[PDB]
Amino acid sequence: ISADQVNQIIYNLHHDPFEILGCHLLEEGKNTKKWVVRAYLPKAEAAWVIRPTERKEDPMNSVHHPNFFECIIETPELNHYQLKVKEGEHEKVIYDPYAFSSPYLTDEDIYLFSEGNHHRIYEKLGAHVGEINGVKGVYFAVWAPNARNVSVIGDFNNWDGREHQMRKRNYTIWELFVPEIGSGTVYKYEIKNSEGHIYEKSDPYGFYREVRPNTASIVVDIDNIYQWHDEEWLEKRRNSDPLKQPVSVYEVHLGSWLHGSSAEKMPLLNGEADPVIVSEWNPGARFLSYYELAEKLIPYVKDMGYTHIELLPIAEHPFDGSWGYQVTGFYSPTSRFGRPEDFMYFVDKCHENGIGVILDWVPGHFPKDSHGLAYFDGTHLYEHADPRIGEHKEWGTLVFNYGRHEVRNFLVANVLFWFDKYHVDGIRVDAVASMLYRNYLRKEGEWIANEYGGDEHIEAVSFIREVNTLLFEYFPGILSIAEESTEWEKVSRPVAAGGLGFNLKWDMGWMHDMLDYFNIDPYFRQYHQNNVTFSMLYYYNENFMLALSHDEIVHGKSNMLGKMPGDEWQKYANVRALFTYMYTHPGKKTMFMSMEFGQWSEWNVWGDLEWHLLQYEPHQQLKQFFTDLNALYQQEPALYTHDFEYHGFEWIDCNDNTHSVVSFLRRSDDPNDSLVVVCNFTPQPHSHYRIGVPEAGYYVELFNSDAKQYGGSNMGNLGGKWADEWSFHNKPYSLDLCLPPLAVLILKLDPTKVP
Ligand SMILES: OC[C@H]1O[C@H](O[C@H]2[C@H](O)[C@@H](O)[C@@H](O[C@H]3[C@H](O)[C@@H](O)[C@@H](O[C@H]4[C@H](O)[C@@H](O)[C@@H](O)O[C@@H]4CO)O[C@@H]3CO)O[C@@H]2CO)[C@H](O)[C@@H](O)[C@@H]1O
Ligand SMILES: OC[C@H]1O[C@H](O[C@H]2[C@H](O)[C@@H](O)[C@@H](O[C@H]3[C@H](O)[C@@H](O)[C@@H](O[C@H]4[C@H](O)[C@@H](O)[C@@H](O)O[C@@H]4CO)O[C@@H]3CO)O[C@@H]2CO)[C@H](O)[C@@H](O)[C@@H]1O
Ligand SMILES: OC[C@H]1O[C@H](O[C@H]2[C@H](O)[C@@H](O)[C@@H](O[C@H]3[C@H](O)[C@@H](O)[C@@H](O)O[C@@H]3CO)O[C@@H]2CO)[C@H](O)[C@@H](O)[C@@H]1O
Ligand SMILES: OC[C@H]1O[C@H](O[C@H]2[C@H](O)[C@@H](O)[C@@H](O)O[C@@H]2CO)[C@H](O)[C@@H](O)[C@@H]1O
Ligand SMILES: [Mg+2]
Ligand SMILES: [Mg+2]
């Protein structure tokens, strides 16, 4: 490019910047092509073009002006790129604003979609505000290849679309522009299928929806509704390895954490809506908005010291009682709590406060509701046609046809959409086995094996691998967490190594072993020391997340206090010891709302939590306990830098099963950061209990779960204890400790203390 052209841009004289900025084809070679990407980035010193799916980065060069950049690249296709932009001492990574000239679908969009590789298809399918033939309006587009006809109905043409029939392209997608409408437009697709039947559909790619039980999509100007402030959090994230950091997750269901009064409007970010009543049986109550949650949940979590909040699914879902796990608007956060910009604000505020957001994501299935994806075009479009792989009969839901391109695409782009539009920091997938197995909850003769006569759902495995490969390339630094409950190997290993490519995996064995263990009367725990120690046998085959989740405190399993034997005192003690052990045991942490203040009742998704218990001392004390524990966790490198290396852990001794005592070391990079942890899992204190340590000196008591400030009896070692040169458990030195009742101690050597 020339200097006159550059200057036209800099001084805003150019007639159409899309001719020059963006990605443009320079020439076609035999095997590859030459492209140029250009960007005008005022205030940027430097820039790069990222080709995330090829795993490449190329620098851009200033040309004629220091903020006008060009990059020339040779590669056959150049569909997927990002700009990395450096403004002084900060870097951001963004999609190229000048990537798409036109709001309508191109031949390139359609081709890519048909191959299943349009990672940004949501920019073109759905509904977008736009200009065509010189007129402001909305462009609508929708995949329905076997439909006979499709129209658009809504407020603007009183729900009759005779004059708004849509043009069908490449025998696959239906499109239409409508002038003079804008965001807020309420609408659906009127589809007539191959048999004359004329059903209505919510927009599969729609970005906002009416409040359940209504289901009309609403048009959002999604790139012009909210102003972010999280550049620095995003940079820190992209350049960090979250597996070597502390990660204590507070799991939350937004609809049932706290309610407000339905006798008032729900405040939003600079606005307000009509309240959404939580149910007809509790009509005095409403949900809080994303906005109100940003104001109440976030500082509450900040205070507790958790690093992350994980949300049960917020994609639009018709029925509260599904907990979110039956989704019908995969491209919108639920209107129960307000608008897309309100959730943006929620995520932005988390980031301002140093807190990550993880979303439960549900690509495994979708319900039969007729507003949604089922039998979409009058065929089995999204679901597999054959119910032996296309239906989950015990759930009454449909399974996505992962081998169908436009379906894979819908899902692969969907996961990316949450990281792109809403800046989230991780996803989790419930019930991964349900995707992995052709025989999932099906008995002999109602399932067909794969090609090679195995149980493996081959299209599913391959969708999962692609999803995770892509996520980490596009947004390095995120968490992709799985719960897979069948011993399937290499879940949290990279696709390269024959993994499924998640980076963390819930340890469900550890959860069963610990809750089974703590549920036994202390006296009999001697018969079950292996519950305590077994998880470390297979521990290194995966990167484990220690999760004690919402699933474990419903449907008659009790909340955590109620799982524990003994009187009130011993019940809180057992909670303290279990969670102290959890936070010291290798792996990342997840725990569910209500557990941190000792709720008695099971989680009830129709009400809110029992906040009034925080008026009382024991509940307050338990909450302080968790507050200090999270504070410690963040503060002590040995508790997070080496969760997943052998160096990070070693048992000191685990043979005293008679007193249900175990002890171990955690280590980090610096050996002065090493910690000694000792657990006493009965209410029998011990008085001169000897534990091998590996160096001499004063070991400070960093933490003692029996402290009276936490509800304990206050037995302890009075701040710490000098080692003895008295060999024990194969170690040169040893400590002669008080073990408080039902309690855990964390000690560290202070190698500069006065002998
Ligand atoms: O200080 C003198 C005593 O110190 C040591 O006692 C220990 C116990 O060995 C531990 O078990 C624990 O006691 C708990 C007890 O387990 C629990 O059930 C509960 O008992 C209460 C009970 O709630 C109440 O209704 C009534 O029975 O009074 C009891 C209070 O003592 O709560 C106890 C904790 O308060 O911790 C204590 C104190 O550190 C030592 O072992 C004893 O020999 C000694 O007498
Ligand atoms: O009565 C007061 C007594 O207090 C002290 O004894 C303690 C020890 O300090 C503790 O460490 C523990 O003993 C455990 C021991 O730690 C554990 O390893 C296991 O020992 C097995 C051993 O592993 C096995 O290889 C073999 O050698 O037999 C050993 C003996 O069982 O189990 C021990 C407990 O059964 O608790 C005791 C108290 O019971 C103090 O040092 C004693 O001298 C004092 O009498
Ligand atoms: O004030 C009138 C009315 O407004 C609201 O109803 C809207 C619906 O929620 C919305 O879905 C839409 O309804 C259409 C269906 O989705 C569609 O499938 C088809 O059958 O036509 C319907 C419209 O005729 O539009 C209505 C109308 O605005 C609000 O929910 C009502 O309480 C209120 O009565
Ligand atoms: O053009 C017919 C048909 O083609 C596409 O389907 C692919 C399918 O996605 C693959 O998994 C594989 O089985 O081959 C098919 C033919 O290429 C579309 O998915 C479909 O809508 C369309 O009508
Ligand atoms: Mg499950
Ligand atoms: Mg309540």
Locate breaks in the chain with C to N over 2.5 A; list the residue preceding each: none
What is the spatial distance between Cα 597 and Cα 304, in angstroms, rounded to a whole number?
11
Which of 523, 617, 713 has the most ligand 1 atoms within 8 A of CB, as the residue to mutate?
A: 713
Domain with CATH 2.60.40.10 in the chain: 100-220
Tokens 């400790």, residue located: 737
DSSP 234-282: HHHHHTS-GGGS--EEEEE-TTSS-EEETTS-EEETTEEE---BS-TTS
- Which is the closest atom of ligand 2 to the Cα of 656? 32
Helix (H, G, I), strand (E, B) or coil at 709: helix
266-268 and 271-273 beta bridge pairing: antiparallel
Greatest Cα pair distance in the chain: 91
Check if 483 is active-site.
yes
Residue with the smallest CA separation from ligand 4 atom 4 is 114
- Which is the closest atom of ligand 1 to the Cα of 713? 39
What is the spatial distance between Cα 669 and Cα 416, in angstroms, rounded to a whole number?
35
Helix (H, G, I), strand (E, B) or coil at 174: strand
377 CA to centre of ligand 4 in angstroms: 15
Q: Which residues of 107-129 are buried (b: 16+ CB within 10 A; e: fewer)?
A: eebbebbbebbbbbbbbbbbbbb
Which of 656, 681, 724 has the most ligand 2 atoms within 8 A of CB, as the residue to mutate?
A: 656
Any atom of ligand 2 within 6 Å of the Cβ of 541: no
| Residue ranges with CB less than 5 Å from ion ligand 5 | 431
Q: Are 280 and 320 in contact (CB under 8 A)?
A: no
Tokens 């639920």, residue located: 334
Q: Are 33 and 75 in contact (CB under 8 A)?
A: yes
CA distances, 307 to each of 304, 353, 582 (Å): 9, 10, 16
Residue with the smallest CA separation from ligand 2 atom 30 is 656
Distance of CA 362 to the CA centre of its chain: 11
Name the method of structure determination.
X-ray
Judged on CB neighbours under 10 Å (0-12, 13-18, 19+), 159 is middle
Number of neighbouring beta carbons within 10 Å of residue 46: 16
Question: Considering only CA atoms, which of 406, 427, 203, 222 is closest in space to residue 308?
Answer: 427
- CATH for the 221-642 domain, from 3.40.570.10, 3.40.50.720, 3.40.50.1360, 3.20.20.80: 3.20.20.80
Sign of the CA dihedral running 281, 286, 290, 296: negative
- Which is the closest atom of ligand 2 to the Cα of 653? 18
What is the spatial distance between Cα 433 and Cα 437, in angstroms, rounded to a whole number?
6
What is the number of alpha carbons within 13 Å of residue 266 lying toward its C-beta? Answer: 26
Q: Are 579 and 629 in contact (CB under 8 A)?
A: yes
What is the spatial distance between Cα 296 and Cα 271, in angstroms, rounded to a whole number?
18
Any atom of ligand 1 within 6 Å of the Cβ of 683: yes
33 CA to centre of ligand 4 in angstroms: 28
Task: Write down the catalytic residue from 430, 484, 551, 706.
Answer: 430
Q: Are 409 and 121 in contact (CB under 8 A)?
A: yes
Q: Are 58 and 52 in contact (CB under 8 A)?
A: no
Measure the N-to-C terminal CA separation of the chain; round to a whole number of Å. Answer: 74
Any atom of ligand 3 within 6 Å of the Cβ of 691: no
| Architecture in CATH for domain 643-751 | Sandwich (2.60)
CA distances, 457 to each of 325, 389, 433, 481 (Å): 21, 9, 10, 20
Q: What tokens were used for 413?
A: 């782009």
Helix (H, G, I), strand (E, B) or coil at 552: helix
Q: Are 183 and 219 in contact (CB under 8 A)?
A: yes
Q: Are 342 and 268 in contact (CB under 8 A)?
A: yes
Any atom of ligand 3 within 6 Å of the Cβ of 216: yes
Q: Are 747 and 700 in contact (CB under 8 A)?
A: yes
- Which is the closest atom of ligand 3 to the Cα of 210? 9
- CATH fold, domain 100-220, is Immunoglobulin-like (2.60.40)
- Which is the closest atom of ligand 3 to the Cα of 216? 11
Q: Collect all residues with Cβ–Cβ distance below 8 Å to 28 and sequence separation of at least 6.
A: none
Any atom of ligand 1 within 6 Å of the Cβ of 601: no
Q: What tokens were used for 479?
A: 């968490």
Residue with the smallest CA separation from ligand 4 atom 16 is 404
Number of neighbouring beta carbons within 10 Å of residue 342: 26
Which H or E element spans position 188? Answer: strand 186-192
Number of neighbouring beta carbons within 10 Å of residue 225: 17
What is the spatial distance between Cα 450 and Cα 438, in angstroms, rounded to a whole number?
8
Which of 404, 458, 462, 463 has the most ligand 4 atoms within 8 A of CB, as the residue to mutate?
A: 404
Distance of CA 179 to the CA centre of its chain: 38
In the DSSP assignment, the letter for residue 384 is -
What is the spatial distance between Cα 303 and Cα 542, in angstroms, rounded to a whole number?
31
Task: Write down the catalytic residue from 483, 484, 596, 706.
Answer: 483
119 CA to centre of ligand 4 in angstroms: 18
Helix (H, G, I), strand (E, B) or coil at 388: helix
Check if 232 is active-site.
no
Domain with CATH 2.60.40.1180 in the chain: 643-751
Q: Collect all residues with Cβ–Cβ distance below 8 Å to 241 and sequence separation of at least 6.
A: 477
**Looking at this protein, which amino acid is placed at residue 749?**
L
| Residue ranges with CB less than 5 Å from ion ligand 6 | 608
Residue with the smallest CA separation from ligand 2 atom 26 is 655
With both helix axes pointing from N to C terminus, report the angle between 568-584 and 508-519 in degrees, rounded to the nearest 10. Answer: 150
What is the spatial distance between Cα 158 and Cα 187, in angstroms, rounded to a whole number?
10
Q: What tokens were used for 46?
A: 């430097």
691 CA to centre of ligand 2 in angstroms: 9
Q: Collect all residues with Cβ–Cβ distance below 8 Å to 635 and sequence separation of at least 6.
A: none
What is the spatial distance between Cα 202 and Cα 318, in angstroms, rounded to a whole number?
12
Question: Considering only CA atoms, which of 494, 172, 213, 469 is closest in space to residue 329?
Answer: 213
Judged on CB neighbours under 10 Å (0-12, 13-18, 19+), 199 is middle
**Looking at this protein, which amino acid is placed at residue 747?**
L
CA distances, 181 to each of 131, 188, 221 (Å): 11, 14, 12
Q: Are 12 and 4 in contact (CB under 8 A)?
A: no
Judged on CB neighbours under 10 Å (0-12, 13-18, 19+), 510 is buried
Domain with CATH 3.20.20.80 in the chain: 221-642
CA distances, 540 to each of 544, 676, 744 (Å): 8, 21, 24
What is the spatial distance between Cα 178 and Cα 492, in angstroms, rounded to a whole number?
47
Resolution of the coordinates in A?
2.5
608 is in an annotated binding site: yes
Q: Which ligand is nearest to the CA of 684?
A: 1
What is the spatial distance between Cα 106 and Cα 314, in angstroms, rounded to a whole number?
32
Q: Collect all residues with Cβ–Cβ distance below 8 Å to 93 and sequence separation of at least 6.
A: 50, 82, 83, 84, 85, 234, 238
580 CA to centre of ligand 1 in angstroms: 21
DSSP 335-369: GGG--HHHHHHHHHHHHHTT-EEEEEE--S-EE--
Q: Collect all residues with Cβ–Cβ distance below 8 Å to 274 and sequence separation of at least 6.
A: 265, 266
Q: Which residues of 537-550 are buried (b: 16+ CB within 10 A; e: fewer)?
A: eebeebbbbbbbbb
Cis peptide upstream of residue 213 (ω within 30 degrees of 0):
yes
Any atom of ligand 3 within 6 Å of the Cβ of 212: no
